[PDB]
Write a protein that binds this ligand. Structure first.
Ligand SMILES: CCCCCCCCCCCCCCCC(=O)O
Ligand SMILES: CCCCCCCCCCCCCCCC(=O)O
Ligand SMILES: CCCCCCCCCCCCCCCC(=O)O
Ligand SMILES: CCCCCCCCCCCCCCCC(=O)O
Ligand SMILES: CCCCCCCCCCCCCCCC(=O)O
Ligand SMILES: CCCCCCCCCCCCCCCC(=O)O
Length: 581
């Protein structure tokens, strides 16, 4: 163990090494062009083969942090381009790498990536596959400097497979564009989960991150003993502290070590783990982070013995409050993989709250005796919400279910901008389509997975351009209460109806030539403004107006001379709609 570069080259292989080196330079030097990075990648690879041949060669005994920072500081354009970042070069290496990380620009000033036409992509992919995917790996990495490099590499290989299958197909667009749409969405979703996990650790505390994670790991590894989950939670906390700080190497070493440990101690952890532990280094931690929940042991008793019926429950809890709440959490969670994590955390917080009041009252035992009965209004709320919404989703379809959510949320918070209202109703409509296809025992974790990110994205938007104190209130009470708080918002009785604007309800025949997607957004936009202009309208009245509108679209798109219709019937639909309301 003499050369860090040599070691990492042998472990990753040359292809994976070159890609990771490209990503890491793209994340630090986000304004240099692609060909500057390619030159750096090749110089670093040529040097890396020098060390594979002879670990004693000059410079091979250097730290990777040292080698990386030295190559950063050879860039002659550095001060002209990045300014203050060039002053990091005057430092010695502990502070130098720290100085470089401070100057990472998440959310930089780059134009949005345009998806080219399908045949443009396939010709480019065929004509120079490597530079096509690599230029795009550069564009993505420089836009997401904190995105964990190996995972970015895993997205790239999914893109490669989609172009290899689809570009040799009969209908390229039909094959490819669903695969690119799923990949785009999962890419944005991963970025947001990571920004969410890091915000939990930064603002709310290491404690809440361990609460989460105990819950999740106990659902995932229900056969494991509490001490083994505590160990894993400790390791996870370090891993994610490091990765949030932005230092790629230490983050990745930590996840590798964690992956190695889990794979050796398979027997104390989970059975559904041999597949992930068969795969190469790069992929194992990623694979484990997603592994299916193991099956719980069949012989599991009520928790009531350990956690309500004991005397020596207030003593046990006072001896180590967080270890005891963790054991409660661990036991509830391994029994309920059908629960969301946040639901298990509400149960845990409820138990804590009562032990705190009851362990210092007259008789404890009879004070906290009916404690599990407090769980049931908490469990049934998410369950009922999902049952009702999946029934609704199956009656309407996805699009008409979006419209249903659109009216609900506009009435709840009519001060939100119309595009945001449309975007989240549409987003949550697709959450119905995906999660309601699960059986009931799996709808709640599926729903939480999408809602927590939608809700955190919403809250971050809102702190920027705020609009409603009630939204602020949900976005800054507990992270755990965020979804129920939103669900509990009632229709806004204070809102002054937005004043009628004739153009907002003026339609032209271009609506017949638009895609279904853009037709629906044009119409979903008009629905929001209709509810914002008449927030008192009933479900019956709105369905009266909406049906009349869909007969005005069909009549005027079926008609000899389209655009005189849209203005003539349009005058009539508005006048009659203003009158029914
Ligand atoms: C000359 C310095 C260049 C920097 C070298 C590139 C550093 C990237 C190394 C990443 C190793 C990742 C191993 C996989 C770990 C995991 O996610 O389980
Ligand atoms: C990582 C490799 C990315 C290559 C895919 C090319 C298409 C990128 C456009 C993104 C979009 O779908 O909006
Ligand atoms: C291995 C033990 C780790 C520690 C686990 C402690 C569990 C905490 C239980 C209370 C849940 C609190 C949820 C976070 C936000 C809050 O405090 O309101
Ligand atoms: C599936 C429903 C699709 C549309 C989303 C609107 C319903 C949201 C309720 C789900 C509850 C979220 C689980 C986590 C929690 O316990 O808060
Ligand atoms: C930028 C500000 C945006 C604020 C968003 C307000 C629009 C409502 C969003 C509700 C999402 C949470 C869904 C909870 C489930 C339910 O519908 O009961
Ligand atoms: C002032 C009132 C004026 C009302 C004019 C009619 C606007 C209606 C827009 C609703 C959009 C309908 C979506 C449902 C569908 O796709 O059929």
């Amino acid at each position: 163990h003499k050369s860090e570069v040599a070691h990492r080259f042998k472990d990753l292989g040359e292809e994976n090494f070159k890609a990771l080196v490209l990503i890491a330079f793209a994340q630090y030097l986000q304004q240099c062009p692609f060909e500057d990075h390619v030159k750096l990648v090749n110089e670093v690879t040529e040097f890396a083969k020098t060390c594979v041949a002879d670990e004693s060669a000059e410079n091979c005994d250097k730290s990777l942090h040292t080698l990386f920072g030295d190559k950063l500081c050879t860039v002659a354009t550095l001060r002209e381009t990045y300014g203050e970042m060039a002053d990091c070069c005057a430092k010695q290496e502990p502070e130098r790498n720290e100085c470089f990380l401070q100057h990472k620009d998440d959310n930089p000033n780059l134009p949005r990536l345009v998806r080219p036409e399908v045949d443009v992509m396939c010709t480019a992919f065929h004509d120079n596959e490597e530079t096509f995917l690599k230029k795009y790996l550069y564009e993505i990495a420089r836009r997401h400097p904190y995105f964990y490099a190996p995972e970015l590499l895993f997205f790239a290989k999914r893109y490669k497979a989609a172009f290899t299958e689809c570009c040799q197909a009969a209908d390229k667009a039909a094959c490819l564009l669903p695969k690119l749409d799923e990949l785009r969405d999962e890419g944005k979703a991963s970025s947001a989960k990571q920004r969410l996990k890091c915000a939990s650790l930064q603002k709310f505390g290491e404690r809440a991150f361990k609460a989460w994670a105990v819950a999740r790991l106990s659902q995932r590894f229900p056969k494991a003993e509490f001490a083994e989950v505590s160990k894993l939670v400790t390791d996870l906390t370090k891993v994610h502290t490091e990765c949030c700080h932005g230092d790629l190497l230490e983050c990745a070493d930590d996840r590798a070590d964690l992956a190695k440990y889990i794979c050796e101690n398979q027997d104390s952890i989970s059975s559904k783990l041999k597949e992930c532990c068969e795969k190469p280094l790069l992929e194992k931690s990623h694979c484990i982070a997603e592994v299916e929940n193991d099956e719980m042991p069949a012989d599991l008793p009520s928790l009531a013995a350990d956690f309500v019926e004991s005397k020596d429950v207030c003593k046990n809890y006072a001896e180590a409050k967080d270890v005891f709440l963790g054991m409660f959490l661990y036991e509830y969670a391994r029994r309920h993989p059908d629960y969301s994590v946040v639901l298990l955390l509400r149960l845990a917080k409820t138990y804590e709250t009562t032990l705190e009041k009851c362990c210092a009252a007259a008789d404890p035992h009879e004070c906290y005796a009916k404690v599990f009965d407090e769980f049931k209004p908490l469990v049934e709320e998410p369950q009922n919400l999902i049952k009702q919404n999946c029934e609704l989703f199956e009656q309407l379809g996805e699009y008409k279910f979006q419209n249903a959510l659109l009216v609900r949320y506009t009435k709840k918070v009519p001060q939100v901008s119309t595009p945001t209202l449309v975007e989240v109703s549409r987003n949550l409509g697709k959450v119905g389509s995906k999660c309601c296809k699960h059986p009931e025992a799996k709808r709640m974790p599926c729903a939480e997975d999408y809602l927590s990110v939608v809700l955190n994205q919403l809250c971050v938007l809102h702190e920027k351009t705020p609009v409603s104190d009630r939204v602020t209130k949900c976005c800054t009470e507990s992270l755990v209460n965020r979804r129920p708080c939103f669900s509990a918002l009632e229709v806004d009785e204070t809102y002054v109806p937005k004043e009628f604007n004739a153009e907002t309800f003026t339609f032209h025949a271009d609506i017949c030539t638009l895609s279904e997607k853009e037709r629906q957004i044009k119409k979903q936009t008009a629905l929001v403004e209709l509810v914002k202009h008449k927030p008192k309208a009933t479900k019956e009245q709105l369905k009266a107006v909406m049906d009349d509108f869909a007969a005005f679209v069909e009549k005027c798109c079926k008609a000899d001379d389209k655009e005189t219709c849209f203005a003539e019937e349009g005058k009539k639909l508005v006048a009659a709609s203003q009158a029914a309301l």
